[PDB]
Each structure stands twice: as structure tokens, then as C-alpha cells.
Short mmCIF file of C-alpha atoms in Angstrom, two decimals:
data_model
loop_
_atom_site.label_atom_id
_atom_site.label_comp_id
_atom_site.label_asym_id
_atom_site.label_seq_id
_atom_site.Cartn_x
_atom_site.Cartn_y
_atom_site.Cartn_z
CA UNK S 538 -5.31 -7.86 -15.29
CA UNK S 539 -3.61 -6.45 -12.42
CA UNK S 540 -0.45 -8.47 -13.14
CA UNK S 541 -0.32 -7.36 -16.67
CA UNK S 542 -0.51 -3.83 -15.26
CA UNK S 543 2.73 -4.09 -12.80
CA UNK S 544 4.39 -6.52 -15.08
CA UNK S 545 4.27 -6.25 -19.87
CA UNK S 546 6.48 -3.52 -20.57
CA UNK S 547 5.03 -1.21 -23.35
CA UNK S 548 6.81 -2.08 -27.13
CA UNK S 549 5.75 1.36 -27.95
CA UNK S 550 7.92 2.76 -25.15
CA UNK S 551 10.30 -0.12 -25.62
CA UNK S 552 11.04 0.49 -30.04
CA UNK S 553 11.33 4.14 -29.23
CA UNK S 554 14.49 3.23 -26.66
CA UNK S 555 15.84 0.95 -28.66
CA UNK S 556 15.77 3.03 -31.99
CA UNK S 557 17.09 6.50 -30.37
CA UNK S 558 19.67 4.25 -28.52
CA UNK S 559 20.87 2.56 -31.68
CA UNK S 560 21.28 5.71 -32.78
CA UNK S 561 23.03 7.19 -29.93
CA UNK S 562 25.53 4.32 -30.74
CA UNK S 563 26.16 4.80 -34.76
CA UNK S 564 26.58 9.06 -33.57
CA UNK S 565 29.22 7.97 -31.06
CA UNK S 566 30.74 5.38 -33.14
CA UNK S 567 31.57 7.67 -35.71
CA UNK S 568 32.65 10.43 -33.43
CA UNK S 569 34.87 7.84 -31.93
CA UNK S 570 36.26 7.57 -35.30
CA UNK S 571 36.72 11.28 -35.84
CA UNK S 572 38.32 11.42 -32.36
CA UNK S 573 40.41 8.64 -33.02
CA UNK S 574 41.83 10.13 -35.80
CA UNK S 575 44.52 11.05 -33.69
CA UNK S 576 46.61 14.16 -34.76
CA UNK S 577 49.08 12.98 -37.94
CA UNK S 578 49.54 16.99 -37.38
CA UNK S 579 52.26 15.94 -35.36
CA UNK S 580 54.09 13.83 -37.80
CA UNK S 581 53.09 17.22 -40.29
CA UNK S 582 55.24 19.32 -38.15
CA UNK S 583 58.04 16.85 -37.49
CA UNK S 584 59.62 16.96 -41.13
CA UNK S 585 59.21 20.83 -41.14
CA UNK U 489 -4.47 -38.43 17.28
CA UNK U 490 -2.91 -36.58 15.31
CA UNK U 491 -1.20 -37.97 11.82
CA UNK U 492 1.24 -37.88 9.48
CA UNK U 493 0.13 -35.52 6.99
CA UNK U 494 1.72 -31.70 6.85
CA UNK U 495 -0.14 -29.42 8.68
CA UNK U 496 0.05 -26.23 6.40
CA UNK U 497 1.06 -26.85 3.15
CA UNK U 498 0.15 -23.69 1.58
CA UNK U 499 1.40 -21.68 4.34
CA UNK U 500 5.16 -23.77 4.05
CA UNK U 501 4.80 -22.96 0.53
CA UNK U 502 4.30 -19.00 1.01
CA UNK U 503 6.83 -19.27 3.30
CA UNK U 504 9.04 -21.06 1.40
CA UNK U 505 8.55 -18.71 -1.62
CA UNK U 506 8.75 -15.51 0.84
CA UNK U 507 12.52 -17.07 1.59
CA UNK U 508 13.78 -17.12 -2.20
CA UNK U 509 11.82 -13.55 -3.13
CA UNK U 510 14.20 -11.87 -0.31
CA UNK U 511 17.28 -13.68 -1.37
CA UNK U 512 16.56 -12.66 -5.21
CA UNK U 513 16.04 -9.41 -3.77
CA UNK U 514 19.32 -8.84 -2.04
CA UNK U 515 21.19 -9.96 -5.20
CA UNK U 516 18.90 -7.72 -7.66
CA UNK U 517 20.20 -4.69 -5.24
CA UNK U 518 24.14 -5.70 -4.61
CA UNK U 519 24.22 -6.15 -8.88
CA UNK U 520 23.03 -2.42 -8.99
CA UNK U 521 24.87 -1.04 -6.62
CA UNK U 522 27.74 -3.18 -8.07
CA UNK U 523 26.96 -1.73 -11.55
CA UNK U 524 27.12 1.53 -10.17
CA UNK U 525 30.43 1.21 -9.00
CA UNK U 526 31.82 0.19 -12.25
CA UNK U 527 30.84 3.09 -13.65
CA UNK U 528 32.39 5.35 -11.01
CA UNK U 529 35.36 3.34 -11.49
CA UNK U 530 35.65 4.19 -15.54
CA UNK U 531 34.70 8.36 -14.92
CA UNK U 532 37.45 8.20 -11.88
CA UNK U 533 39.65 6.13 -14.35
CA UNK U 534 39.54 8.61 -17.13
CA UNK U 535 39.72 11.92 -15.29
CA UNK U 536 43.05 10.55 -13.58
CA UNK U 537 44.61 9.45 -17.17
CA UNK Z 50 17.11 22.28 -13.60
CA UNK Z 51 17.80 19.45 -15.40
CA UNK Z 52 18.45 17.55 -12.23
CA UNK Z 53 14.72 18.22 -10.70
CA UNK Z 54 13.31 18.10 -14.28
CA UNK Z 55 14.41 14.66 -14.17
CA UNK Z 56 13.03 13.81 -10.26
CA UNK Z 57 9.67 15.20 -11.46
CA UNK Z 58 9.44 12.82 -14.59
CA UNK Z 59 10.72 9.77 -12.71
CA UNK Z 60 8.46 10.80 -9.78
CA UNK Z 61 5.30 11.49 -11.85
CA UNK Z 62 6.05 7.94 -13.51
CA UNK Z 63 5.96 6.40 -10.68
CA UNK Z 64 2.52 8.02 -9.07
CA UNK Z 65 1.29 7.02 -12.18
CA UNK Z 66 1.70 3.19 -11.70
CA UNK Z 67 0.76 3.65 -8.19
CA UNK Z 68 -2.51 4.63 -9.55
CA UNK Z 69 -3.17 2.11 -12.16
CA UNK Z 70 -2.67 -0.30 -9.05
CA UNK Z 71 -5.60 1.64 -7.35
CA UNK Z 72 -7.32 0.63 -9.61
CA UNK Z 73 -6.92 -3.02 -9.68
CA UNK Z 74 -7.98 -2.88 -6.18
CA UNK Z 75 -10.74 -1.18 -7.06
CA UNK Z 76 -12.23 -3.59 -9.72
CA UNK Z 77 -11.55 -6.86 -7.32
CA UNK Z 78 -13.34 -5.12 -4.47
CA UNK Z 79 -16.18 -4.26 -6.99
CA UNK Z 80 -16.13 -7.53 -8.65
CA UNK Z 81 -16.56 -9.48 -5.07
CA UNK Z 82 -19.10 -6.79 -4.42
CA UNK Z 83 -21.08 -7.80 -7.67
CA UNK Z 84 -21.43 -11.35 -6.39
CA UNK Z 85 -22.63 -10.72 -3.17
CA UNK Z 86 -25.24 -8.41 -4.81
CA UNK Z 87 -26.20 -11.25 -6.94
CA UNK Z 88 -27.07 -13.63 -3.63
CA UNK Z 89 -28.86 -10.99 -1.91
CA UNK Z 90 -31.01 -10.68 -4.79
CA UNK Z 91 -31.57 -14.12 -4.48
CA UNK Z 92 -32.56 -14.29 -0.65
CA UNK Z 93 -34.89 -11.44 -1.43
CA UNK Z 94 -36.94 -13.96 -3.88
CA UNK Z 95 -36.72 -16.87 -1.78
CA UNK Z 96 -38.06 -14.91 1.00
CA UNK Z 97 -41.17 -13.26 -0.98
CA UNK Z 98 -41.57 -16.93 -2.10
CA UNK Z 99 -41.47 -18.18 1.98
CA UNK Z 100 -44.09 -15.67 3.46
CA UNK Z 101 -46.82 -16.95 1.55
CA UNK Z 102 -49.15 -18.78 3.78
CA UNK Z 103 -49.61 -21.98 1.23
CA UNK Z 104 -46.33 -23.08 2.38
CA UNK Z 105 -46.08 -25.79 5.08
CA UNK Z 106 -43.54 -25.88 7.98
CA UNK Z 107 -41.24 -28.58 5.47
CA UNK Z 108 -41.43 -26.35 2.65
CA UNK Z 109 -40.07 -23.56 5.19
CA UNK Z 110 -37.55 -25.57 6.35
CA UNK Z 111 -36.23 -25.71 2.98
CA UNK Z 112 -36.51 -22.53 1.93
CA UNK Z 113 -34.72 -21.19 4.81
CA UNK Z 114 -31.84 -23.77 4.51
CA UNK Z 115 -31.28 -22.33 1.38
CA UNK Z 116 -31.48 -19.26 2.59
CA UNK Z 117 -28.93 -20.01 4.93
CA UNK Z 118 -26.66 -21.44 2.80
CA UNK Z 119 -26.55 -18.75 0.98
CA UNK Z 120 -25.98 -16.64 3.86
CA UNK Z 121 -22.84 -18.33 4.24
CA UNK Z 122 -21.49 -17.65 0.88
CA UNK Z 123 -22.31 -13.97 1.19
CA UNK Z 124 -19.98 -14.28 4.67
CA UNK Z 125 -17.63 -16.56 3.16
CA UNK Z 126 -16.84 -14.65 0.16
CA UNK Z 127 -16.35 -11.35 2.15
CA UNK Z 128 -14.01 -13.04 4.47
CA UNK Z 129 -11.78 -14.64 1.95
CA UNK Z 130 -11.57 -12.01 -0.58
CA UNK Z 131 -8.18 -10.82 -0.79
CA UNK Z 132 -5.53 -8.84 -2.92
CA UNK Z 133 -2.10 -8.97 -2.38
CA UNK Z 134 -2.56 -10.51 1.04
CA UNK Z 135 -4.96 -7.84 2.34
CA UNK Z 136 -8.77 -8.50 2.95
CA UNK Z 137 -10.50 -5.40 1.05
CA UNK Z 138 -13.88 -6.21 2.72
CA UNK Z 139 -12.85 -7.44 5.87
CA UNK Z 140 -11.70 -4.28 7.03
CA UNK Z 141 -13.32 -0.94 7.97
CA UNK Z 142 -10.30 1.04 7.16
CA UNK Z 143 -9.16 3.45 4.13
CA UNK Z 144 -6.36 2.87 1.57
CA UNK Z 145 -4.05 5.62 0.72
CA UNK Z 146 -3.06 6.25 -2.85
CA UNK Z 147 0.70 8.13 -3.77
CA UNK K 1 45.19 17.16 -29.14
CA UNK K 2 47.96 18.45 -31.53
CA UNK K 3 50.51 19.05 -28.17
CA UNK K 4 49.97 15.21 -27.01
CA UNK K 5 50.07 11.91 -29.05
CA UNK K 6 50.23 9.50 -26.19
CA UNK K 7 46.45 9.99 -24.48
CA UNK K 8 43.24 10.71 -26.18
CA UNK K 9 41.30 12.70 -24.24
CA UNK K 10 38.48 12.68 -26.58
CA UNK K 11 38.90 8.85 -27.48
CA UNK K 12 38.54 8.30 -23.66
CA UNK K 13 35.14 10.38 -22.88
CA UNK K 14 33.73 9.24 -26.29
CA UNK K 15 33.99 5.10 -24.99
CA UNK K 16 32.68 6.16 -21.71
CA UNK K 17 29.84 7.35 -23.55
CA UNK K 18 29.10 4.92 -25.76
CA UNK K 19 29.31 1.96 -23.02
CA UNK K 20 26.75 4.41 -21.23
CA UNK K 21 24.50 4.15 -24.24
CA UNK K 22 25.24 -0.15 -23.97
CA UNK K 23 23.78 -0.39 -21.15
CA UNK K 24 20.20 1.01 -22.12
CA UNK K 25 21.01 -0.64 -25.47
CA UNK K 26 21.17 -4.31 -24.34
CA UNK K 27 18.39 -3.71 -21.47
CA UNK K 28 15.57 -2.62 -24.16
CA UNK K 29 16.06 -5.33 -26.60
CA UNK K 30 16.04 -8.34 -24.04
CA UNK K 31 13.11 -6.32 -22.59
CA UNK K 32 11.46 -6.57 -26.32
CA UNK K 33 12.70 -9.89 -26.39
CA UNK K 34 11.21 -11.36 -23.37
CA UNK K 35 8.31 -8.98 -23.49
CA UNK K 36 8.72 -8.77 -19.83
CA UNK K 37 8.74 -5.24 -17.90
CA UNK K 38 10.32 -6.70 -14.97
CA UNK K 39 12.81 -8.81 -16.36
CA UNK K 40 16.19 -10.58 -13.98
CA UNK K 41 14.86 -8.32 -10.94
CA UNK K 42 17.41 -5.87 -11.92
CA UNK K 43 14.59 -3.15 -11.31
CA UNK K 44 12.05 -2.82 -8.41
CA UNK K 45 12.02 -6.30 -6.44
CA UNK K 46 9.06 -5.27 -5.08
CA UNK K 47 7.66 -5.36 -8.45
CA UNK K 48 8.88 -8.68 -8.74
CA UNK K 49 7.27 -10.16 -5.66
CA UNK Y 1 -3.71 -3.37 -26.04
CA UNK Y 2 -0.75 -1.90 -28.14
CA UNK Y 3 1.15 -1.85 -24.49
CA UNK Y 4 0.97 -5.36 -24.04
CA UNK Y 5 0.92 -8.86 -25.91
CA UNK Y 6 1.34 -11.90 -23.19
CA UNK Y 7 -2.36 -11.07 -22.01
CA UNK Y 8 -5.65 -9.99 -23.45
CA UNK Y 9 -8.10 -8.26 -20.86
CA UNK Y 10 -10.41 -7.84 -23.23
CA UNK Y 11 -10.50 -11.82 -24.32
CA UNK Y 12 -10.71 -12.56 -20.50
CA UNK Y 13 -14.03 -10.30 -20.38
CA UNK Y 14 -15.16 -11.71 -23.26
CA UNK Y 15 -15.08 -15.62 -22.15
CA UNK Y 16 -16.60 -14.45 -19.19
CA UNK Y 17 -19.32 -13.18 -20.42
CA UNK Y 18 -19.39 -16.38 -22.95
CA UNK Y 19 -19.75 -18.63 -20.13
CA UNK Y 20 -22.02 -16.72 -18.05
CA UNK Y 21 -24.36 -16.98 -21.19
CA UNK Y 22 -23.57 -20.77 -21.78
CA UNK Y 23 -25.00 -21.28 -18.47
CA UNK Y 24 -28.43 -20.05 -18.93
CA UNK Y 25 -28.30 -21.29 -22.76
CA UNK Y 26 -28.45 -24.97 -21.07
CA UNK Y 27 -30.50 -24.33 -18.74
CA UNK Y 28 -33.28 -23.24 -21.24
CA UNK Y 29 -32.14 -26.00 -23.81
CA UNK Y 30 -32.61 -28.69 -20.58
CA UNK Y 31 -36.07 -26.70 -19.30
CA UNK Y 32 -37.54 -27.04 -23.66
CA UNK Y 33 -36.65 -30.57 -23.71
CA UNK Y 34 -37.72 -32.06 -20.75
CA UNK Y 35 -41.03 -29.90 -20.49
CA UNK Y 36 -40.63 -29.38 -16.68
CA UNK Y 37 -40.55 -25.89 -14.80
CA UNK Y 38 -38.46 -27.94 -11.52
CA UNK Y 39 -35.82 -30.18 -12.87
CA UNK Y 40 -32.99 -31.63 -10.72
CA UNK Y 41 -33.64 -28.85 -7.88
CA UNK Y 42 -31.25 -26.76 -9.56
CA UNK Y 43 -33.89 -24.30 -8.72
CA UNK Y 44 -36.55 -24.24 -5.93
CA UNK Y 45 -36.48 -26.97 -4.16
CA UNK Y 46 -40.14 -26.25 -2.31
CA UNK Y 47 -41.30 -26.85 -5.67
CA UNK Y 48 -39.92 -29.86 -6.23
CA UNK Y 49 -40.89 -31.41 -2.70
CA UNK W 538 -20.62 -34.81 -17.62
CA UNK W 539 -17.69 -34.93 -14.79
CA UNK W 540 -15.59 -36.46 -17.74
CA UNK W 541 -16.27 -33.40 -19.77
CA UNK W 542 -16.00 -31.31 -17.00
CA UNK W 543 -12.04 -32.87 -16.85
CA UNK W 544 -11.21 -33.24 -20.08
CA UNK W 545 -11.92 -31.20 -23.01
CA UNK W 546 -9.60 -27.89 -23.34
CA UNK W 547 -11.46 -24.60 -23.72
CA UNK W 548 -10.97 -23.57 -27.52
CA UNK W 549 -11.27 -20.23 -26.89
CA UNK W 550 -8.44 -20.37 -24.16
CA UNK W 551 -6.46 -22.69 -26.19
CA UNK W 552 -6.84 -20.56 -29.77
CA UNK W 553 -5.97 -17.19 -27.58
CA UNK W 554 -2.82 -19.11 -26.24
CA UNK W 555 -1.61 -19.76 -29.58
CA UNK W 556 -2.35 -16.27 -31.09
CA UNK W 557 -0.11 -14.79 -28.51
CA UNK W 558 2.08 -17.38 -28.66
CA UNK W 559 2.60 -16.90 -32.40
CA UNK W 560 3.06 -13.02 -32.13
CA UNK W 561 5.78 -13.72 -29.33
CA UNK W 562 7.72 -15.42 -31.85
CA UNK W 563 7.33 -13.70 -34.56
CA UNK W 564 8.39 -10.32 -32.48
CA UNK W 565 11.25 -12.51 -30.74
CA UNK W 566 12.68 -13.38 -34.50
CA UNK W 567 12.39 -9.95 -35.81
CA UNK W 568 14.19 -8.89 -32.20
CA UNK W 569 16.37 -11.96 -32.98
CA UNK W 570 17.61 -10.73 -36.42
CA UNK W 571 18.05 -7.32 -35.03
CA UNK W 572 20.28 -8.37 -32.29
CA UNK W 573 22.30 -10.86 -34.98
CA UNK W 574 22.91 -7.12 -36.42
CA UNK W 575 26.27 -8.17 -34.61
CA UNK W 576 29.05 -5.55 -34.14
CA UNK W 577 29.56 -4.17 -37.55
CA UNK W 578 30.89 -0.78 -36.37
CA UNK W 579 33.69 -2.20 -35.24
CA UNK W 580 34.39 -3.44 -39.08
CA UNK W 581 34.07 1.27 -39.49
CA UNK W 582 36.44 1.54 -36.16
CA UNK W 583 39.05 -0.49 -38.39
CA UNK W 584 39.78 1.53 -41.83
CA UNK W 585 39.84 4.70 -39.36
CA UNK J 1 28.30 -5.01 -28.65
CA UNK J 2 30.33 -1.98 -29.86
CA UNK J 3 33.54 -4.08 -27.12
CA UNK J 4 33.09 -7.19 -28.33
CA UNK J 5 32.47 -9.54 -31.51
CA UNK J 6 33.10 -13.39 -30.48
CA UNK J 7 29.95 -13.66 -28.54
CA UNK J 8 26.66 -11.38 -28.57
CA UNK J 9 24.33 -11.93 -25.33
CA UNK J 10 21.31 -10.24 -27.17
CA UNK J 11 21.14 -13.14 -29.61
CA UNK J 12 21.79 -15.78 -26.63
CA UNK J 13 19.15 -14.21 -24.71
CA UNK J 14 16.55 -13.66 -27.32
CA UNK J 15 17.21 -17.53 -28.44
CA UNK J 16 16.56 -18.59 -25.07
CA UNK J 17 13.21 -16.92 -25.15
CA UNK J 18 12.27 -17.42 -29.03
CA UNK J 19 12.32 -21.48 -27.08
CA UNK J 20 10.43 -20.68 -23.83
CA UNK J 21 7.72 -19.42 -26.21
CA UNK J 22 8.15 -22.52 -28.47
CA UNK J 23 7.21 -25.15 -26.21
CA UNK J 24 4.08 -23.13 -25.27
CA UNK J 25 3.50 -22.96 -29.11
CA UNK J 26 3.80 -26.48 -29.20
CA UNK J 27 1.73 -27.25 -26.24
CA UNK J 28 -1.15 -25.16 -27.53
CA UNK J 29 -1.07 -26.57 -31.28
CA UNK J 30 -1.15 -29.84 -30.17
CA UNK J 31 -3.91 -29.21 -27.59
CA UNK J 32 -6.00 -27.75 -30.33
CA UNK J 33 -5.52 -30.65 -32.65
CA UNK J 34 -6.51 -33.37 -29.98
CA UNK J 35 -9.10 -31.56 -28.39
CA UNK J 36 -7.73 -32.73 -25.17
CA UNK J 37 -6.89 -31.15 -22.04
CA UNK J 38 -4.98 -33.80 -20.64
CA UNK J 39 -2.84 -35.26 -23.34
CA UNK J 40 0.11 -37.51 -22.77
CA UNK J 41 0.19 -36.74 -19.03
CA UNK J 42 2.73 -34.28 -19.26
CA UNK J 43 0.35 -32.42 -17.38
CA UNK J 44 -2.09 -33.36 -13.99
CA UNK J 45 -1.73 -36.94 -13.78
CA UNK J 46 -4.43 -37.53 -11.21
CA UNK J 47 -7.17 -35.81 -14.33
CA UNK J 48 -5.48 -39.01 -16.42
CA UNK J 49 -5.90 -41.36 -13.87
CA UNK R 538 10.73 -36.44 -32.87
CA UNK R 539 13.97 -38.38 -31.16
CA UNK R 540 15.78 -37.98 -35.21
CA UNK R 541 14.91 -34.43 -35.06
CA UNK R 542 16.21 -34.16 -31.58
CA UNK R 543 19.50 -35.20 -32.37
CA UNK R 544 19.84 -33.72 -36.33
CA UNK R 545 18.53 -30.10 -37.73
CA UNK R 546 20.60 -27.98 -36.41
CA UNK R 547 19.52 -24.77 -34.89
CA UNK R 548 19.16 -22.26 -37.73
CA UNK R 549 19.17 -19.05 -35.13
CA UNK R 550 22.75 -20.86 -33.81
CA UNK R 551 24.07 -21.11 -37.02
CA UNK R 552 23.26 -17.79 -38.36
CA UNK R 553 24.47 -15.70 -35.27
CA UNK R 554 27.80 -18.56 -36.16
CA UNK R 555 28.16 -17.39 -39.34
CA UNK R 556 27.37 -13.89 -38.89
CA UNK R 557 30.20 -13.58 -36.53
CA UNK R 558 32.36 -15.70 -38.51
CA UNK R 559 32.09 -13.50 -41.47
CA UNK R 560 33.16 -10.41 -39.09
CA UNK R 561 35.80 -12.01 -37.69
CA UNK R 562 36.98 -12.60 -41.35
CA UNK R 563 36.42 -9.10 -42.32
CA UNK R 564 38.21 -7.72 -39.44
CA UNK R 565 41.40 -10.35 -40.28
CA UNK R 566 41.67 -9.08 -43.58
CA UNK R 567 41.63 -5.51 -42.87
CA UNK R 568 44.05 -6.12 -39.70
CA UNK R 569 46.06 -8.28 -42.46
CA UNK R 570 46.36 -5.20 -44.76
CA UNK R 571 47.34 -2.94 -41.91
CA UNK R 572 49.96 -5.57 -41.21
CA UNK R 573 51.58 -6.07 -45.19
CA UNK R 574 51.76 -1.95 -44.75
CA UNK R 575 54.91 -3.90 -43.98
CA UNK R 576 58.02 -1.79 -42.34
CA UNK R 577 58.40 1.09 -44.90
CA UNK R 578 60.08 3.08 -42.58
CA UNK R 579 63.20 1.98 -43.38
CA UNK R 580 63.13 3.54 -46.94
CA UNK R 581 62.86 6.56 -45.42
CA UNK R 582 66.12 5.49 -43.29
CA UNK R 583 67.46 5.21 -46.01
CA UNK R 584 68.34 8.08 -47.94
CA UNK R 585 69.00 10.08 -44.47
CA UNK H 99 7.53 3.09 -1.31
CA UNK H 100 5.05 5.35 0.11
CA UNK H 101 2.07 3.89 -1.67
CA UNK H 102 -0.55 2.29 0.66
CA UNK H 103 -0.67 -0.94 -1.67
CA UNK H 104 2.62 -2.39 -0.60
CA UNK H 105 3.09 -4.69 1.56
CA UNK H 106 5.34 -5.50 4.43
CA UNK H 107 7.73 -7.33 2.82
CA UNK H 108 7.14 -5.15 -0.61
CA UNK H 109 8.39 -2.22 1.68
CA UNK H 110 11.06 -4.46 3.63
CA UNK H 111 12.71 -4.89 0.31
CA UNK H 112 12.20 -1.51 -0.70
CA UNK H 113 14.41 -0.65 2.23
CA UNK H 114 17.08 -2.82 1.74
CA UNK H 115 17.58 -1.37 -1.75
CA UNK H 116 17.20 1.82 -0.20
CA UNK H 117 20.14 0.91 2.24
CA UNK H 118 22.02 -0.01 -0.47
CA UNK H 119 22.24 2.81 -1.84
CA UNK H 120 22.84 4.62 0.89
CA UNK H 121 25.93 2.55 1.40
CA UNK H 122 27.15 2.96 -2.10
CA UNK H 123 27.10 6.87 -1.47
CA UNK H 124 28.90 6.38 1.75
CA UNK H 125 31.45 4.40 0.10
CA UNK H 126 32.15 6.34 -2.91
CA UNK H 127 32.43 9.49 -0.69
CA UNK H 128 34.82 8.00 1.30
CA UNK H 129 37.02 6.19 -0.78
CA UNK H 130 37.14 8.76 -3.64
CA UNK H 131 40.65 10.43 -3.83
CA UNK H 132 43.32 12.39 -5.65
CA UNK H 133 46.67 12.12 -5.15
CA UNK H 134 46.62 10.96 -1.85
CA UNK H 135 44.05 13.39 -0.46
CA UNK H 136 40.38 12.37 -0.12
CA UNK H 137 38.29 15.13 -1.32
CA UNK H 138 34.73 14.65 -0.41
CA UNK H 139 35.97 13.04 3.32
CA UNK H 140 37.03 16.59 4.49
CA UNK H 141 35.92 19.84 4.87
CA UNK H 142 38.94 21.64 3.93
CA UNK H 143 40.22 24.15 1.27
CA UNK H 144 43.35 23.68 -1.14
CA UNK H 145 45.04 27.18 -2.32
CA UNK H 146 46.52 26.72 -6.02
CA UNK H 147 49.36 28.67 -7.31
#
């Protein structure tokens, strides 16, 4: 018993981390995207 | 008269285990401070670019 | 804020498994302490079985190398009882808890 | 962003962030995996011993 | 319980209780079928003698 | 009775082996097919 | 993950598990079925002896 | 047993294999389309 | 660390992560620099235009 108390890690505590941190990853995948849509207002002033 | 057999096997043993546990140890703390330093490395590299 | 917000989380965690091994000490100590209980209980017949005066000086012979046997388990047990490489009842010290 | 084309700023702090959020990423699911707390000794060794 | 899955406290506590029962479950089966009080000194022995 | 005492696995340890046993791999196959969720963002990073 | 595509260490990781669990899977099934604790002396060959 | 040890492949290793696979397809074909937005640029040379 | 429970060697290997990271802050203190000038290894002042 007191090995599963130092050692077992908690899925509760463990799904929660993994869930908010998958999430944490789609939010700065598509920011990356946004980001990386990298000014074409450049190219919009160059003909002018 | 004494024999052939070992003396203290279970104490060896501890012993024995004692030895790897540090060693695993010392590499457990150099790969975090290691990991650390990586990330150092990326913050420095992007506030100099 | 943030900063010590964070030290006082991580810190609390941390008493908190400190605890929970408390307890673990706790429940082996009582656990060994049950057993002993057990052969004491034990002795305490055989002896209110020995002082009778029906016995003969065999029959006390036995019952007091039983007696004495168990004797040694109650010393035995308290000597080798042990968690993590520290004899809980071969000590008359204290513990202290973060 | 619309006075420079040849560094992104943004681009650069964004990927910093998201290997930050990697590294929690990757530890919880080989955690749920293995079903381990202490898992590789890349935590408290003491824990380990 | 919901913490943890690669032991069961409770199932430990419950086979040890199981075989603390077992124990005196043969003793009374052994003490019905032989018809004897003292059997194999497993008891007291300035009974027996 | 010493031959028994050698032989003959407890049940009960044997059947609360297996139950754990069987929920570790049923949680390390639903884990598994959550990891084989292999980089797809990177298929979003593209069209960007 | 979000760096790389050609390999993914979750999935090597939580294979490498999935089959540490498997061969205690086995061990118990078969264990049950014989009603055996010793069986095949892949175990304590001294309690087969 | 010794058959089985030697055929049936691993359907976890095959999965994550195709899984990948399929990606690195995906990825080709968009990077392929990218690429056929062959050099245009030289219209616009063109008429300057 | 401070907990009674641990050990010797539990608080032996506490310390050597401890010194660990001790040295990591020494080193990243030291070695972290701009331009040629190491900020955090002096006690200095730089006047901006």
C-alpha cells in the first residue's frame, strides 16, 4: 500500500493534463497558422 | 574453518542495488538540468533573432 | 503573485505526500503492534492455565516453554520490524512530519 | 509585421510555445501509458529509490 | 481506487481477512471430524501429554 | 499438504492479476490509438 | 509531435508497455487455466524439482 | 506458438505504419501542388 | 527533503539534484550575454541614447 501511495500516478489528474494540453496544442497550432500568415500586405503595397 | 560460501548475500545485494540507484540518480538530474538548458538556449535564441 | 502562488501549490503538494507517507508508517507500526497484542493475549491464557495446582512440574515445563517461545516472537518481531530501513519499534525516538 | 518580411516575430514565440506545451504533452500520455507516477526517474530519484 | 489501477488495497484486505478465516474454518472442520478437543498439539500441549 | 502448500496458485491472487492486467491493456490501447493520433496539424500548417 | 511526422515516440513507448503488460496477461491466464503455480519452470525451479 | 512467433505481424506496428504513411502522402501532395504553382512569375515579366 | 521519512541516501540524492541546480543557475548567469557584454555577471549600469 505504501508503494502504491509514492508510486500510481492518478488518471484523473493524468486525462485532465493530457486533454487541456492537447488543447493548448490545436490553440497554438492555429495561432501559428494565423501568425504565419506572414504579411502579403507587403506585396499589396509593392504594385501601388 | 571457515568456507566457501558468501558471507552476506543480502547485504552485497543492497549494496549492490544502493550502487545503480545513485548512478540512475545522477543521470535523472544531469537530463534535467540538461533539459533546462535547451530551453534557455531557444528563449536566448529567439530574443537575439 | 503568480510566482509565490505557484511555490504555495507546489509546496502544499508536496506536504501533502509527505503526509500520506505518515501514514504508511503509521499502519506498519500498528499492524506489528496488532500481532504482538495477539501473543500477549496468548501468554495471558497459558499462564491462567499454568497456576492451577493440578498441573505437575512436566506439564509446567511445557507450558512455560511455550511461553517462552512465544516470548521470543514478541522480541523478535519488535526487533526486525522495519520500514524503509528504520526500526519503528526499536527506537524510543519521535518522527517528524513536513 | 507589415515593416519586416524576413523574421517572424510572432512565428518564433508561438513555436517556443507550443514545444513548451510538448513537453507536458508527451510526459502525461507515457505517464497514462505506463500507469506509472514515477516513470524514467526524470522526477524525484528519491521517489524512485 | 479511481487514482490507481496496478494495485488493489482493498483486495489485499480482503484476502487477508479470507485467509485469516480459512484458518479457523479447518481447524473446526479437523476438530468435527476427528471428535478430539487436542489434536496434533496445534493447541495445548499439557493437554495432550 | 507441503505439496499443496508449493503448488497450487491462489485464485484470488491469480483472478485479481488478470483483472488489472486486462484494464492495463485496454487503457494502454485506448492511450495507444490516441497517441497514433499522429501529427495531423502539420497536414493544417501546410494549406496556410 | 507538432516537429515531426516519420516517427512518434508516444506510440513506441505505449507499444512497449501494451507488451510488458501482455506477458503478465499471459502468465496469469495460463496460471488460471492449469491451476498451477509452478508451470513449465519458467518460474522457481527448486518448487519443480 | 514458434509459427506465430515468426508470422502475424504486429497490428499496433502496422497501423502507426500506415498512419504515418498516409500523412506523409498527404503532405507530398499538398507540397506537390505548392510546387506545379509552377514559376508564374514570369507572366508577369512579361508584359513589363 | 525536509521530511523525517527520508533516508540518508533519499536525502544524499536529494542534494545532488539540489546541487545541480544550483550549478545550472550559476552557469546560465554567467554565460548569458549580449553583444559581447555579460549582463547578469556585473553590477553595472548601461545609459541608452
Amino acid at each position: 500500500e505504501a508503494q502504491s501511495r509514492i508510486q500510481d500516478a492518478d488518471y484523473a489528474t493524468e486525462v485532465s493534463n493530457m486533454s487541456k494540453a492537447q488543447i493548448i496544442q490545436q490553440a497554438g497550432n492555429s495561432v501559428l497558422a494565423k501568425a504565419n500568415q506572414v504579411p502579403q500586405q507587403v506585396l499589396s503595397l509593392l504594385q501601388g | 574453518s571457515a568456507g566457501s560460501a558468501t558471507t552476506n548475500p543480502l547485504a552485497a545485494l543492497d549494496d549492490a542495488i544502493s550502487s545503480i540507484d545513485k548512478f540512475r540518480s545522477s543521470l535523472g538530474a544531469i537530463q534535467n538540468r540538461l533539459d533546462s538548458a535547451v530551453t534557455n538556449l531557444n528563449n536566448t535564441t529567439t530574443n537575439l533573432s | 503573485i503568480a510566482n509565490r502562488f505557484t511555490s504555495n501549490i507546489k509546496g502544499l503538494t508536496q506536504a501533502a505526500r509527505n503526509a500520506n507517507d505518515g501514514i504508511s508508517v503509521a499502519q506498519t507500526t500498528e499492524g506489528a503492534l496488532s500481532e504482538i497484542n495477539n501473543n500477549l493475549q496468548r501468554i495471558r491464557e497459558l499462564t491462567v492455565q499454568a497456576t492451577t495446582g493440578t498441573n505437575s512440574d512436566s506439564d509446567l515445563d511445557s507450558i512455560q516453554d511455550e511461553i517462552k517461545s512465544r516470548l521470543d516472537e514478541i522480541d523478535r518481531v519488535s526487533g526486525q520490524t522495519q520500514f524503509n530501513g528504520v526500526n519503528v519499534l526499536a527506537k524510543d525516538g519521535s518522527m517528524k512530519i513536513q | 509585421m507589415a515593416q519586416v518580411i524576413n523574421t517572424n516575430s510572432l512565428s518564433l514565440i508561438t513555436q517556443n510555445n507550443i514545444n513548451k506545451n510538448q513537453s507536458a504533452l508527451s510526459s502525461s500520455i507515457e505517464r497514462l501509458s505506463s500507469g506509472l507516477r514515477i516513470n524514467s526517474a526524470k522526477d524525484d530519484a528519491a521517489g524512485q529509490a
